[PDB]
Design a protein around this ligand. Structure first.
Ligand SMILES: NC(=[NH2+])NCCC[C@H](N)C(=O)O
Ligand SMILES: NC(=[NH2+])NCCC[C@H](N)C(=O)O
Ligand SMILES: N[C@@H](CC(=O)O)C(=O)O
Ligand SMILES: N[C@@H](CC(=O)O)C(=O)O
Ligand code: NA
Lengths: 703, 695
């Protein structure tokens, strides 16, 4: 009911208030630098989600939409796991996921002084790199030596906190053999996918299941046929006795990005540029994409993750903008900045007003460039796959006459053609309506002299975006795999250098890097000013009582299970049920199709031990915890640190929580652990997974 | 929350239970055959709405959407009362309304015997007369006698009840000078108009205000400049102390149509024919019309009442079909008919099974006869306005007398067609063609009207046949009409292709009616028989008949509901709910800046709730339907606390089966009405005439 995404180091400062709210854990149970704690079971999944370890054999719970990527990679029309789900009945049946990584925090260390000496010590500093997660983590070898650039299963991550006023280093253990164990069908894992997304009430069985594997010694490893299940330090026990309104809830995970120190001008700019442009372009992309998917099951698999990811950010941006409107978020941030300015004024501090003024100036100044960046990013880089077309390298200059180097150049083109023309790319989807609809709006919004060279010249020569795209596919050697291979049997140097799809990709990448290099003149003073401003906020409040913005590192949040009042006349309860699914069923609406087995279960009320005390079958619940993107898959724990749920979304009003926590409107939306178990047991019949999890049901205990 | 639209005569049978629910009125207070009662203040408005009298000088409250037709008629781009509302500050400023009538029920009498004994010796009956309001009412002279019957200020109404098993007569005092006193702007009067229509929560200030006028001697009269305000026997006192969940609510009004005695098959037919067809046709009409209205201010005014009326039936049909499906209403009615069937079996009554059999058979036989009656109605007769295009040719074309009377009539026939609200520019472009396109798509060319068959055949399309209608007909524009009007030719007048249209449309209409009588006559006869059985089984004093646009009462409590998993709706809405919905770029959620300023300043006076919020709407467990708009909602002591104006979404299925947990009447809090008059319009005179109690 109070917000903030707290550092693991900040547990000592929160533990009293957490206990007063009914928590029955000690601080060292949650985070222990000198031993085992809940931290060890709370896992970063695939770079941008959370997972929780729930058995001594490394079983890993996370969301369906977090596992969505790997589910999609294993799917085909024949074996459509997206549609049908997937269940493994032994370890040998668990699917290998090449490239998939899971990370566990081994150590947390303040490296503020070390990083600052190192940021200093730079002649002619780039605009600003004291915030770059790339550059900062490149400092790790100098901070810890060989133990970094040597130890195979380790990764050192250094990030900026408080706008660059602190640096914390996370020592990570990296698992590179993570196998898919189970997933529900998408009619369960993403029931009401578009319409119910960012919405409470919710009725979505959003989970998937993986397992960490390790080598003969229990260490993280690359995939091997001889790897065995990882046996974790600590795992979380599942409590399946139920939850009620008022219950203390604890969440740990990896929240990605928040903006709690935004000034009023930053709120408006983010709304007017980043969010508006994302909503505009992605709406176009999605109208076309969805139509193509519903009409063809192979296309639907190919573009499933691409579409789900686009839609998710599209609707999030809609939610953020309506939150700013309905909750008056800009006015709140203005009032807060005025408080810190009044604080500084009273203390005789002049820097703070300087910072706020320099922020406004940088925002106002970068307006043209940023809007160009967002249109380029949203309309072309993300939606038009032609951006990834091959391009010639040391063909044509260093060595077209050299047999060895020419073969290497032809090889390079062959290699990036395979990356471009991958199994998820459909030229039909791309050349028919998608690329043309996006480029037509793009060209309308960006004036001709500010468009990438190939696009402006292409539209001038041919009639339009539509004519220019059609020409690109008529003439490019990469329009199809068959044309490509036919050309490669007799490669021509010209034609290779003049390829209009290759020209398109090169002009877009050139403008992307040009926009970046130019906008640095604004983004730099902006970042310096932000550091100054947050430094004042750190003086006013103290560091121990100030939660920093999310930056994809381990955090905890807490609060209680609780519904809310979205609007006049309306009250939303805290807990969802299976009857809510049946109320929504519509065989003719793709997002509300219900699996006949689930319906059969409901009509027979065959819920076994997973039912509520009133006889209804629980599905989701919601809580006053403070989460954001990256917190998907986060374990939700009761007062005793037992697993009662999996976090997977926020309510509509809660999208505003990235800018300001409002206790009456902010809610995490959570998968009831009893629903998860019900789907495993009664729906799928995968009893061995029930056996391995060992859910606690409150029999008396026998010793 | 027991449901039923009770006869006024059935008040004696209901009063005990009503008192059990908190009512502290007597029966005679509500209806009194031999003296003044609440009946005298509850009024039928414009033939199809309700209103209520609230001052001793004949002030009349009704809904905004009931007065919409008159607000629309008086409006123009300058003096735009639809957009800006309208307020009169003296008697003289009140706006005259030619054609608008209001009826007050004077007396109610049982005429069952007399009526039945007169439907005998109708040599060779059509089989449809005994349900006909006009035929039945045309029987009234020989019931009451020529003298009381020919009275200028009275009208006699006779309608069938219980499917034709009872007949009651209503004597109406009829007022033909009803003047507009006040209306809020449409941003208040239908806030959230399409999206929030048929929906709770609701935040709509749905009212308008009229006044009844009379002559020197205080009696009903035609308009005349010398008319004075009518002084009612009784009028309803307004209570402004507020309401809360659980309060008793009484409603009186004129519910139009319900179908509580439908068999299963009738539920099925009504759904898949009437509603399905209304929905698809009105969907296409609405799309076109709204885009036109929104793109041009003047069009928006001309077509405002047409669009709103259409959209309201369109969404109602959506709601009705949604109820049929989600409450399995067919199976519920099936269960009910099987309880009366089993009842008949244990009595040895063969009547009922044959009736249910005959209903099924008639529904079966009239399928595409009636399936076509509706496409014609929805697609053409109501959508396409050239359906009313115009001695004378033959009989006296050469005679300067009946060739001098003929075409002037065709000018009174043309003025009615090309009227103040008709825009030929909208028709061609998309309207008439989009409708006819779909029409022809779904009616075999063989079955279409003889004019329509001809030209999709000749010309490439319906699009081009309409294109030919305007290019080659005299009535396509007023300029073209008055030009070849000094030049009356007797060859291209019968050959006018827009006239050829209206004639065949109207012909194919009547032939369907004639063809359907062979199925509708047995259907009606069989329904009568069924409902007679239901009447035998249940008591008549305890069975409420279907609505039939006569005066009824319903009662219940102020109460919200739980529409779906996780969700609870409260019983009362507030002004904050308006402000939460505001969107300057969405026409239906536009908020007047004076209303928002009142909200920002909390300038509510004695009209606010106790918690300081400003009430707007509330909802109740009463049983209402189309025709109850503008009905007075009264408290335990017969005092006015609201005006009914809608149902919630689940409530639409209430015309087939009443569901206590879901069915709600959506009601204008009378304090919101007062607040808009007082704080928003500053029309203090109306607040003085009304005189709210705050006790
Ligand atoms: N496209 C989806 N429905 N994704 C699943 C829900 C993800 C959730 N809104 C977070 O972010
Ligand atoms: N089109 C409208 N919103 N009309 C006003 C509401 C009418 C109400 N649904 C009855 O019938
Ligand atoms: N659904 C988000 C979580 C959130 O935005 O609250 C995610 O995938 O991490
Ligand atoms: N809105 C309707 C009332 C209802 O159908 O409940 C009317 O005009 O009478
Ligand atoms: Na500062």
């Amino acid at each position: 009911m109070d917000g903030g995404m707290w550092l693991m180091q900040q547990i000592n400062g929160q533990v009293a208030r957490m206990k007063s709210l009914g928590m029955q854990l000690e601080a060292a149970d949650i985070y222990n630098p000198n031993g085992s704690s809940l931290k060890d079971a709370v896992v970063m999944f695939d770079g941008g989600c959370t997972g929780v370890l729930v058995s001594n054999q490394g079983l890993l719970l996370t969301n369906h939409h977090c596992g969505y990527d790997q589910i999609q990679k294993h799917s085909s029309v024949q074996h459509n796991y997206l549609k049908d789900g997937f269940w493994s009945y032994s370890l040998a049946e668990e699917l290998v996921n090449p490239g998939l990584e899971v990370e566990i925090v081994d150590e947390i260390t303040d490296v503020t002084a070390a990083v600052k000496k190192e940021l200093e010590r730079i002649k002619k500093p780039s605009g600003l790199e004291f915030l770059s997660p790339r550059y900062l983590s490149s400092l790790a070898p100098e901070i810890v030596g060989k133990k970094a650039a040597s130890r195979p299963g380790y990764r050192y991550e250094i990030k900026a906190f408080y706008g660059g006023n602190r640096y914390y280093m996370f020592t990570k253990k990296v698992f590179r053999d993570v196998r898919l164990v189970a997933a529900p069908p998408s009619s369960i894992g993403k029931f009401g996918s578009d319409t119910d997304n960012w919405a409470w009430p919710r009725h979505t069985g959003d989970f998937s299941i993986f397992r960490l594997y390790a080598d003969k010694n229990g260490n993280p490893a690359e995939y091997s046929k001889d790897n065995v299940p990882y046996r974790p330090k600590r795992w979380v026990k599942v409590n399946a006795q139920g939850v009620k309104e008022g219950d203390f809830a604890l969440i740990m995970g990896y929240p990605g990005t928040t903006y709690k120190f935004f000034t009023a001008d930053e709120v408006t700019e983010w709304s007017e540029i980043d969010n508006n442009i994302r909503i505009e372009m992605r709406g176009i992309l999605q109208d076309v994409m969805l139509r193509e998917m519903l009409a063809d099951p192979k296309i639907n698999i190919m573009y499933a993750a691409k579409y789900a990811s686009s839609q998710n950010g599209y609707k999030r941006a809609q939610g953020a903008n309506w939150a700013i409107r309905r909750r008056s978020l800009r006015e709140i941030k203005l009032a807060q900045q005025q408080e810190v300015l009044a604080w500084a004024k009273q203390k005789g501090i002049a820097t703070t007003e300087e910072a706020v003024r320099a922020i406004s100036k940088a925002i106002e100044g970068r307006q043209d460039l940023r809007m160009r960046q967002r249109y380029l990013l949203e309309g072309i880089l993300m939606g038009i796959e032609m951006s990834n077309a091959p391009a010639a390298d040391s063909d044509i200059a260093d060595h077209w006459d050299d047999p060895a180097r020419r073969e290497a150049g032809l090889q390079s083109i062959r290699k990036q053609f395979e990356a471009f023309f991958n199994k998820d790319y459909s030229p039909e989807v791309e050349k028919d309506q998608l690329a043309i609809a996006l480029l037509t709006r793009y060209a309308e919004r960006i004036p001709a002299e500010k468009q990438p060279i190939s696009i402006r010249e292409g539209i001038a020569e041919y009639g339009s975006a539509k004519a220019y795209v059609e020409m690109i596919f008529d003439k490019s050697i990469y329009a199809s795999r068959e044309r490509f291979e036919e050309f490669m049997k007799n490669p021509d140097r010209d034609r290779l250098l003049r390829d209009p799809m290759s020209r398109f990709a090169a002009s877009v990448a050139y403008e992307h890097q040009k926009l970046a290099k130019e906008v640095a003149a604004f983004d730099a003073p902006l970042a310096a000013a932000q550091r100054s401003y947050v430094a004042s906020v750190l003086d006013m409040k103290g560091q121990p009582n100030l939660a920093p913005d999310a930056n994809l590192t381990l955090r905890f949040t807490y609060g209680e299970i609780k519904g809310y009042q979205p609007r006049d006349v309306v009250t939303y309860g805290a807990k969802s049920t299976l009857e809510g699914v049946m109320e929504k069923e519509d065989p003719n609406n793709w997002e509300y199709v219900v699996d006949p087995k689930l319906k059969a279960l409901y009509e027979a009320k065959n819920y076994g031990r997973y039912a509520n005390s009133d006889g209804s079958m629980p599905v989701n619940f919601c809580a006053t915890t403070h989460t954001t993107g990256g917190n998907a898959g986060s374990p939700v724990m009761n007062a005793r640190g037992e697993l009662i749920g999996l976090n997977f979304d926020r309510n509509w009003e809660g999208v505003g929580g990235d800018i300001e926590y409002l206790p009456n409107y902010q809610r995490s939306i959570i998968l009831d652990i009893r629903y998860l178990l019900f789907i495993i047991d009664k729906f799928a019949g995968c009893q061995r997974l029930i056996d391995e999890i060992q859910p606690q049901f409150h029999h008396h205990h026998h010793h």
